Chain length 106, copies 2
């Protein structure tokens, strides 16, 4: 539940989704990502330790993770529709944003 | 806390933000919208009462409100930066998505 471990779970489950061959594996990885993205929004990365809870920086942080959760939800939509290849593509598109957020708040 | 009340809250606070003449008014209305959107996302909307909670339609529902929350976050970012004109503009962009979600799931 600290921010780095949640970012790792996001990062690791991206690789898992790409190597995934079946729908259960993709859905499991997306479910783990959604949980990790919501838990990461409750955590404090180093660049936010000294920032007020209503600071623009905190709101920008929350924005990034709420959008990420929204995108993982849409990937879960596709997966549950039986469009698993589309769901994997949707997830893979998150890699640069996950990595960008990882570095921004490091 | 049902979905209809929360959608009404999103609707009416959009007009509050439109007519606001000070920063606290916009920030509080966005705060009320955020609470309404998150509370509305925990609910089951009328259109989906007959659907599994793991259904693609429910993930699409969750995706829409997660994106909406994400956008409210960014408007609160802007308002707390003291760019209330920009916050108002960002909030106007939600009136479209609020109304579309209300129409889809009512």
């Amino acid at each position: 539940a600290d921010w780095e471990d949640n970012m790792e779970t996001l990062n690791d489950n991206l690789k898992v989704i790409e190597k995934a061959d079946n729908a259960a594996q993709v859905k499991d990885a997306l479910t783990k990502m959604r949980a990790a993205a919501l838990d990461a929004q409750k955590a404090t990365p180093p660049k936010l330790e000294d920032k007020s809870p209503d600071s623009p920086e905190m709101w920008d942080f929350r924005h990034g993770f709420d959008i990420l959760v929204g995108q993982i939800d849409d990937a879960l939509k596709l997966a549950n529709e039986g469009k698993v290849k589309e769901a994997q593509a949707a997830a893979e598109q998150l890699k640069t944003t996950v990595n960008a957020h990882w570095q921004k708040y490091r």
